[PDB]
Amino acid sequence: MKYMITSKGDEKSDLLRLNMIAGFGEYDMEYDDVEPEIVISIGGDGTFLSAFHQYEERLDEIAFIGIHTGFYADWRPAEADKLVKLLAKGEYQKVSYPLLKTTVKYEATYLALNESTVKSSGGPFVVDVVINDIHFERFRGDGLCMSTPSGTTAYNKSLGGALMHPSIEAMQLTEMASINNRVYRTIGSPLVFPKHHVVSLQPVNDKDFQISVDHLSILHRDVQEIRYEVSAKKIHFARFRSFPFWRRVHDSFIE
Amino acid sequence: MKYMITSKGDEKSDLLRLNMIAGFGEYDMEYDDVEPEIVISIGGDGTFLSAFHQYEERLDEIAFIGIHTGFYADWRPAEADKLVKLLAKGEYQKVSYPLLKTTVKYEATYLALNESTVKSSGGPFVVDVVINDIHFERFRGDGLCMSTPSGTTAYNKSLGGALMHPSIEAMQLTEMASINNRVYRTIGSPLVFPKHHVVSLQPVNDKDFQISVDHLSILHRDVQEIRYEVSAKKIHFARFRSFPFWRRVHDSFIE
Amino acid sequence: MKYMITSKGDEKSDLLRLNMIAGFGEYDMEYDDVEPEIVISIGGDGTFLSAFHQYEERLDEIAFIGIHTGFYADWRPAEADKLVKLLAKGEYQKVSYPLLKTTVKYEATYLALNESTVKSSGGPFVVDVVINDIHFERFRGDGLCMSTPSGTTAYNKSLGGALMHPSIEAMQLTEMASINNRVYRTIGSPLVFPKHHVVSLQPVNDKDFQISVDHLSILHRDVQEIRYEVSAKKIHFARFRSFPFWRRVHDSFIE
Amino acid sequence: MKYMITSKGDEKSDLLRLNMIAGFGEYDMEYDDVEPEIVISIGGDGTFLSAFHQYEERLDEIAFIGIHTGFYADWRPAEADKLVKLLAKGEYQKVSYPLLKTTVKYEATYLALNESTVKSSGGPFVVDVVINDIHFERFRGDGLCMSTPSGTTAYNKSLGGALMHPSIEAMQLTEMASINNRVYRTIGSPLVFPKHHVVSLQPVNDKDFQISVDHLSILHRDVQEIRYEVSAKKIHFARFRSFPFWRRVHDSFIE
Numbered sequence A, B, C, D: 001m002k003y004m005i006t007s008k009g010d011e012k013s014d015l016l017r018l019n020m021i022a023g024f025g026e027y028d029m030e031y032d033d034v035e036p037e038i039v040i041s042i043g044g045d046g047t048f049l050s051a052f053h054q055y056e057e058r059l060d061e062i063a064f065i066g067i068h069t070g071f072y073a074d075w076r077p078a079e080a081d082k083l084v085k086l087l088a089k090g091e092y093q094k095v096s097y098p099l100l101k102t103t104v105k106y107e108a109t110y111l112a113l114n115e116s117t118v119k120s121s122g123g124p125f126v127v128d129v130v131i132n133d134i135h136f137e138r139f140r141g142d143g144l145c146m147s148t149p150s151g152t153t154a155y156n157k158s159l160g161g162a163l164m165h166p167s168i169e170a171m172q173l174t175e176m177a178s179i180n181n182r183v184y185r186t187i188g189s190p191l192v193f194p195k196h197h198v199v200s201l202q203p204v205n206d207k208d209f210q211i212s213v214d215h216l217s218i219l220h221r222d223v224q225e226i227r228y229e230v231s232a233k234k235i236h237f238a239r240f241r242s243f244p245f246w247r248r249v250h251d252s253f254i255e
């Protein structure tokens, strides 16, 4: 089947990609970076994120695999030949993780695999947080982060967020340095939203925001609304062997 | 239909219960505290918790309503006559929240509407946390809290936990004063588990634990295992009008 | 004695300043915004911060008073005539709060009354934290905040910092969204440093930083070192009546 | 000079103590556990805490040394012979850390080297926090912890407290699972108090408290007041070589 391999671009990753390409050549197994059914990323989570964003229009057609030279991998370099062989035989099942939809109105829509965050253009950050049309809080602070379940181990975690198992179709909102006093009040806790709940951020002053979607960070001017919802689209991973999310978490954070 | 009313036992709550009983007398609408289809609690969340635990064997037969003299209410005293009338007409729909199953092996099983917590008998607290048979961490600290989604606003919140919408069938584990240094390591983040994930606590030293289930707190001796799972049983509420969970959260925590 | 009055610039503050100027005219009591012995700020803490930075070269000659139209005030508008009279009689004692020295080497030196923070130019933020020449941690995250004792109620608080009584000559370092995993480690706790302890931040990648000092925020390029120490200089307040720091904290945060 | 050695009581610690006693026998250097000038603790911080509490009446006469078989040590077993020799020559300087005074009125007074905490007898915990006679907050939650500067790395840290350098004569109050909503309010931040500030805890309901002082935990009945102040007494350590507090912190928490 059709496949491609992205690389981090250092000497180790490129050489490992070339050797895999040669290994796939022994099967067949066409290399195609236009319309692949399998996308292999060799590098770190940054590389994997770039891979995902490179093919975010063909998510329903692709299964992703990651090699870690690393949360979204999966595979070590020395196991790469085993991977070539298993991938060749099609000895794998597919696992789907939920994604986050960000809509910015002035409409621009973005997909996040990890999170989408909002900060001012610098800038005291003040927004009204509206949940399913109900005014929930006026947030004052450094910014806000909306994470997918697989993103919960990333920026979310650093902000005091809960780790959520990715079989849960949800998104989680965390505060960055919220101001709380006698006058200003936020909830001061992460919030976990189900699919079909809509969280809207509305400007108070100040309509210019620095908006991130995974690695991408761009200044948006004249914003009327930032809207979050769990996406209808999912990312598919190829697997291969049991590597439970909680084991993956243990390995990345405990030992 | 059959109904009963529990009261906090102060003068305001009892008098309000008597007046409701008289109001229900005008319809019919039998009072029955043995096998009711409707349980009305007048007091605070403590009263509501007692009401739930009083009828935890007939959860699939009962719809609960709360009057707040108050997170699980619902109703103010001055609206009580409206409630009598709407309840009388059956002008209501049913909402279900998920519950937590606690199993203690030496088997004793408990249902929690809010949370189940574990602390030592005093006592350095040290347990191994096992998730679906995988050893995740050795927890050292003051204790652990496992919360339902509606419990997330209670003890969970105080411990840095996320608020979860109760349409999500999950349970959330929070740490109490975890010790983290060069030698001792916990995840240091709340964890959100889906239905059918099992979290087991296993003793390291020390087999005596103070175990709470909502209001109930009992010392357990010679414990082999404490097991958490999202219950197959649900609590049903009667509603009546739109009062969204996030609005309820706003009202209790923001203003 | 010589005095000046700064104003927030809204209609209420200007009018209140004019009336005070007229009140001081009845005594004498020269207005002098070049070399004042007394600086009155009418507005909020922003106004007070601007006032402090306007005269940071004559700190040892000035006593500051704040009117709140407000943590650094002190006075309500309706009490302004009492203030004019007490100030006129010299019926006041002086209270001194410690300040923070920031040195940026490529040397630029800054004084902070609240805090000095560091973030990347955008930018993954990674610095080595060196304490009295000992390499303490490599910090990865969003940034760092170094606060004076009176700043502890501001940005510091939002970041999980302790509130310190300003009779303690210290500075306190807080983390912004620190990354902690199996590979990356920070202390994950605020740190309180005495006078004569030096905290140095050293670049790892990346030598461009966005550095804040109270309200001022500027991008610094080609940085070799950022150095923090409790300053030898102090801010003096005029007081007037007992208004204890902990009472001030209660009033701003509790009720 | 007069000395004694406490041991953890395992085979390694006892044998190491015997060998040190023999080493000291070669000098002289009388062993005296009644009125020693030097107290050596071999074990962990628990052993060191027991050593401190064993001689808390002769603190102004004793210098403490710790051997770690370990925050309050100082020394590894393999260095013990070097210690015997340096101690013998008197090649050491003295470092003093501040302590906490706890007073319980119904007066019982306790000294803490680490912390003094308060929880209910089980028991919703509710107390009024009074600072220098001013009513600061009504605390509702699991309990409170008051830490010395050297205790800041212990229970304090686990509760989100700041690490304070022990050259600062202070005490720090941290919350255990504080309840904060629309009705109930705490400061939600650690508080750092200078010497001569008095923090008083006053019962609201409920006059029975479980009070800890380092390792000691006792139920107190019919309490009118719990009073905290930085003690006039200090603990003295013998040193020997440079081992800075921040280095000690690095070694215990970073690597």
Ligand SMILES: NC(=O)c1ccc[n+]([C@@H]2O[C@H](COP(=O)([O-])OP(=O)(O)OC[C@H]3O[C@@H](n4cnc5c(N)ncnc54)[C@H](O)[C@@H]3O)[C@@H](O)[C@H]2O)c1
Binding pocket: A044, A045, A046, A047, A049, A070, A071, A072, A114, A115, A150, A151, A152, A153, A154, A155, A156, A158, A214, A215, C124, C140, C141, C142, C176, C177, C178, C179
């Ligand atoms: N303070 C913070 O936690 C912080 C700040 C900014 C960005 N980020 C993260 O960086 C990501 C993208 O940046 P980049 O990779 O281009 O460079 P980067 O250096 O900013 O982030 C990469 C680091 O984050 C880790 N990471 C990425 N996804 C993860 C996941 N889901 N779980 C655990 N760790 C994960 C990577 O392994 C790597 O260590 C963003 O999606 C965001 O999550 C984190």
Ligand SMILES: NC(=O)c1ccc[n+]([C@@H]2O[C@H](COP(=O)([O-])OP(=O)(O)OC[C@H]3O[C@@H](n4cnc5c(N)ncnc54)[C@H](O)[C@@H]3O)[C@@H](O)[C@H]2O)c1
Binding pocket: B044, B045, B046, B047, B049, B070, B071, B072, B114, B115, B150, B151, B152, B153, B154, B155, B156, B158, B214, B215, D124, D140, D141, D142, D176, D177, D178, D179
């Ligand atoms: N530090 C803490 O947050 C803490 C400590 C112990 C117990 N608790 C809570 O107390 C509950 C039962 O105790 P009790 O009611 O018999 O007496 P209690 O005084 O210990 O708790 C009652 C308080 O908790 C509130 N509460 C109960 N359920 C809630 C919910 N789901 N969301 C928000 N607030 C809620 C009540 O309104 C009331 O203010 C437990 O289920 C536990 O959640 C909390």
Ligand SMILES: NC(=O)c1ccc[n+]([C@@H]2O[C@H](COP(=O)([O-])OP(=O)(O)OC[C@H]3O[C@@H](n4cnc5c(N)ncnc54)[C@H](O)[C@@H]3O)[C@@H](O)[C@H]2O)c1
Binding pocket: A124, A140, A141, A142, A176, A177, A178, A179, C044, C045, C046, C047, C049, C070, C071, C072, C114, C115, C150, C151, C152, C153, C154, C155, C156, C158, C214, C215
């Ligand atoms: N997330 C945050 O807490 C955050 C983010 C950026 C800046 N700041 C603060 O803003 C200050 C200066 O900004 P500005 O005033 O020009 O505009 P600003 O809007 O960014 O900050 C002003 C707000 O902070 C409050 N404040 C200032 N000093 C305080 C103090 N010591 N204690 C308690 N509250 C205090 C003011 O009363 C006002 O509500 C900085 O010194 C920094 O402390 C805070």
Ligand SMILES: NC(=O)c1ccc[n+]([C@@H]2O[C@H](COP(=O)([O-])OP(=O)(O)OC[C@H]3O[C@@H](n4cnc5c(N)ncnc54)[C@H](O)[C@@H]3O)[C@@H](O)[C@H]2O)c1
Binding pocket: B124, B140, B141, B142, B176, B177, B178, B179, D044, D045, D046, D047, D049, D070, D071, D072, D114, D115, D150, D151, D152, D153, D154, D155, D156, D158, D214, D215
């Ligand atoms: N969640 C918690 O952090 C927690 C809970 C209860 C007690 N404690 C601590 O335990 C201490 C006494 O108990 P124990 O030693 O008899 O048995 P213990 O097991 O309860 O505590 C001993 C542990 O705490 C560490 N410790 C002691 N003092 C320390 C210090 N100042 N800095 C860093 N770590 C330190 C020890 O090295 C050891 O790992 C108390 O003083 C309290 O600080 C901590």
